[PDB]
Amino acid sequence: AIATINPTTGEICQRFKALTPAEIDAKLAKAQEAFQAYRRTSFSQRRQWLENAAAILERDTSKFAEIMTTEMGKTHQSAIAEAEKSALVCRYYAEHGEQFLANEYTETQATESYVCYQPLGILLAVMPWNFPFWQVFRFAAPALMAGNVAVLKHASNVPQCALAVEAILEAAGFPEGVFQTLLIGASQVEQVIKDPRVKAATLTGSEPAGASLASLAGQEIKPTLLELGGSDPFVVFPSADLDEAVEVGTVARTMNNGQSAIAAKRFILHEAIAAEFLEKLHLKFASLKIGDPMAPETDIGPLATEGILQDISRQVDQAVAAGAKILLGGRPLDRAGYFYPPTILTEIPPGAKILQEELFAPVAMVFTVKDLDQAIALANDIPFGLGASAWTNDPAEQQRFIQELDAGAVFINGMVKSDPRLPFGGTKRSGYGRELGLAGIRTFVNAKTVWLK
């Protein structure tokens, strides 16, 4: 079950043995001991080690990117970008961690009254295959800067990525036990959450996994953060810069072979520009290059696993049988590896099941609306609420989109992106809590109120 299976060829490359319950317990004993020493290290020391990690990532972007591409199919170029972004968040918290965690004083009758910020202890992180480096470093950099230690349960299909991350942090100088990768199955996460030494947990992934982790953690009185799926709207109104919206919209839907929680999944087009936008989108998708993700000319690699392929294939077939129209694509390719083509679906019947589902593949759903009220209602008519993008140069419309779109992030005239400098997270069924910015490092600390007479 824990194995590298190359999605370009379907070949099983490397298998790994899962930890036994005793071995998990041993890793946790080591983490606990490591935490006792690590919480006493200086911010200067942690900064040095994080900067070292950033430098390792910066130096070997291509090597790390090749691991990511091999294991889960994203283009080598996009994996290089992922390695760079991972270094970026390391540097961000190296640079800002101390100031972000400094005492905050409040004037009272006390001689001293303030809040200080101390680490909780061992944090469990459960992470997904789609950004196998970035999701890990997004969590790890602030967690470690704050003085926590971490155990990582990565997706079972990216074990080499999981081991690589641990190795980078060891090479950077972080003490043994400060960051450990657990080669374990989803069924074994319960043992970790139930362990008295584990103080908190974070999960990035899908709802079933997050519901399981958060319910178990809640039962144990442990705080959580969940970053789950999205069906983000990409709304285009008549005053939009249409050519830019088409180009950026195409990237947003097709990046990471469509496998992004913040992909543009539902294109919502004002009737006045819908025909032009849709033609241009159609043309853009029609000429994307599908193939070997190691080849620099490739736009679209294979989907990450056979299951991901079967899922989208089923979802699209069912929508089409219900009366959705296929403008482009809409069937898996007859070639080795888990290839699914760029696809555009239109005229989706009201109440079609697909309208409520996340399409984790390069498959655009397209909608025409008459006005702003309709656009907002449709954009929000999903269980999720992660990101949203809207395109308009009318100030009043911009403000309505900002205020009224039910999402954790609203981007005006650009595609949704995470950036270390700003917090990032979901609402509704997309989760809760915020990674990145100040929020990221404040999540897994004891905010201890101190009052000295």
Ligand X SMILES: NC(=O)c1ccc[n+]([C@@H]2O[C@H](COP(=O)([O-])OP(=O)(O)OC[C@H]3O[C@@H](n4cnc5c(N)ncnc54)[C@H](OP(=O)(O)O)[C@@H]3O)[C@@H](O)[C@H]2O)c1
Cα gap 298→344, rounded to integer Å:
19
Selected from 213, 246, 304, 328, the binder of a copy of itself by CB under 8 A is 213
Q: Token match 């999960």: residue?
A: 203
Q: What is the CA radius of gyration of the chain?
A: 23
Query: Any contact of residue 446 with a copy of itself (CB under 8 A)?
Result: yes
Distance of closest approach, residue 120 Cβ to ligand X, in angstroms: 17
132-161 residues in contact with ligand X (CB under 6 A) are: 135, 153-157
Residue 431 near residue 210 (C-beta atoms within 8 A): yes
Residue 5 near residue 12 (C-beta atoms within 8 A): yes
In 312-442, DSSP assigns E strands to: 325-328, 343-346, 363-369, 387-391, 409-412, 431-432
- Binding segment toward a copy of itself, per CB under 8 A, in 108-116, 184-192, 316-324, 369-377: 108-116
The residue (of 79 and 246) whose beta carbon lies closer to ligand X is: 79
Euclidean distance between the first and the last CA atom of the chain, given in angstroms as a whole number:
58
- Pattern 227-246, binding to a copy of itself, x per CB under 8 A? -x------------------
Query: Any contact of residue 360 with ligand X (CB under 6 A)?
Result: yes
Query: Any contact of residue 78 with ligand X (CB under 6 A)?
Result: no
Residue 118, binding choice from a copy of itself, ligand X, none, Cβ under 5 to 8 Å by partner class:
a copy of itself
Residue 115, binding choice from a copy of itself, ligand X, none, Cβ under 5 to 8 Å by partner class:
a copy of itself
The residue (of 282 and 400) whose beta carbon lies closer to a copy of itself is: 400
Question: For residue 240, which amino acid is it?
Answer: A
Distance of closest approach, residue 298 Cβ to a copy of itself, in angstroms: 28
Alpha helix ranges (H) inside 347-404: 372-379, 395-404
Backbone CA torsion sign across 126, 128, 129, 130: negative
Cα gap 442→433, rounded to integer Å:
10
Within 10 angstroms of residue 297's Cβ, the number of other Cβ atoms is 9
Query: Any contact of residue 408 with a copy of itself (CB under 8 A)?
Result: yes
362-401 residues in contact with ligand X (CB under 6 A) are: 386
Query: Any contact of residue 222 with a copy of itself (CB under 8 A)?
Result: yes
Burial of 399 (0-12, 13-18, 19+ CB in 10 A): exposed
Selected from 34, 79, 123, 126, the binder of ligand X by CB under 6 A is 126
Contacts of 28 (CB under 8 A, 6+ apart): 122, 151, 192, 195, 197, 198
Cα gap 84→63, rounded to integer Å:
12
Query: Any contact of residue 187 with a copy of itself (CB under 8 A)?
Result: no
Distance of closest approach, residue 35 Cβ to ligand X, in angstroms: 23
Query: Any contact of residue 218 with a copy of itself (CB under 8 A)?
Result: yes
φ, ψ for residue 203 (rounded to 5)?
-140, 130
The residue (of 60 and 98) whose beta carbon lies closer to a copy of itself is: 98
Residues that bind ligand X (CB under 6 A): 126-131, 135, 153-157, 185-186, 189, 204-206, 208-209, 212-213, 227-229, 261, 358, 360, 386, 426
